[PDB]
């Protein structure tokens, strides 16, 4: 059960959350690019 | 006078400068049960004789670092070293340990100097002692 708490260490959660947010942003750009305002 | 054999040493550039014959030098004497090698505080290794050893150094801190090495880096702990200050007029003033007891242990007859009957936070304001020539901790 130590691997579950090893993933639970702070750098692994912060890198997983950074990858998740970066994936969301990259996917929203590659679906809908070039947004400077609300049309 | 100061007695003891000088530890056998090849000589080094880290030793005494003209301050030793001009202002002051320091001496450390210790008794040794055997002949073993110690580290000079001026760099390098020296061999201390069996019996009395007398070493001349430039600073009091070098003598006290040697004494710390003597107390801590030898399996029979050399705990009887005496550190003196030597003046070029020839007068030798005994320094350490001053009362014959190492200062980490209490001794009667030691007077409290540098002791303050107030706390650290109840020193007076500097503005109260302007143009007096004395600091808040000196009053």
């Amino acid at each position: 059960d130590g691997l579950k708490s090893f993933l639970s260490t702070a750098p692994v959660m912060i890198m997983a959350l950074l990858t998740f947010t970066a994936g969301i942003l990259i996917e929203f750009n590659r679906f809908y690019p070039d947004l400077l305002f609300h049309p | 006078e100061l007695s003891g054999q000088p530890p056998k040493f090849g000589g080094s550039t880290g030793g005494l400068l003209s301050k030793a014959n001009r202002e002051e030098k320091y001496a450390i004497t210790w008794t040794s049960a055997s002949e073993q090698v110690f580290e000079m505080p001026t760099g390098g290794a020296a061999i201390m004789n069996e019996g009395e050893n007398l070493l001349y150094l430039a600073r009091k801190e070098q003598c006290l670092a040697l004494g710390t090495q003597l107390r801590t880096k030898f399996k029979p702990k050399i705990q009887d070293y005496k550190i003196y200050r030597v003046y070029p007029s020839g007068e030798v003033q005994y320094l350490h340990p001053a009362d014959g007891v190492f200062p980490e242990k209490v001794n009667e007859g030691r007077e409290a100097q540098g002791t303050k009957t107030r706390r650290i936070g109840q020193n007076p304001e500097p503005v109260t002692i302007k143009f007096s020539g004395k600091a808040p901790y000196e009053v």
């Binding site: - | 304001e125 500097p126 503005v127 109260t128 302007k130």
Partner: protein, 73 residues
């Protein structure tokens, strides 16, 4: 150009000296008893609020100015 640059440099020096000599006043000349509960000692009282709010607005300005400049670049 020389006149404007010279006077803004002199102004920066004088303002830094003003704050430095205010610090010197606080070190040497400040009486907390004679200045009790006035504006000086009240500024001493909430000095953490002033320092933290200046730090927040400096972080705000630097973050967003650098973000806009780097986005543009």
């Amino acid at each position: 150009a020389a006149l404007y640059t010279h006077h803004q440099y002199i102004a920066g020096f004088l303002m830094v000296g003003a704050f430095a000599h205010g610090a010197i006043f606080f070190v040497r000349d400040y009486d907390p008893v004679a200045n009790k509960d006035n504006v000086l000692a009240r500024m001493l009282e909430h000095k953490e609020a002033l320092i933290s709010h200046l730090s927040w607005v400096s972080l705000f300005l630097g973050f967003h100015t650098l973000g806009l400049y780097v986005h543009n670049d």
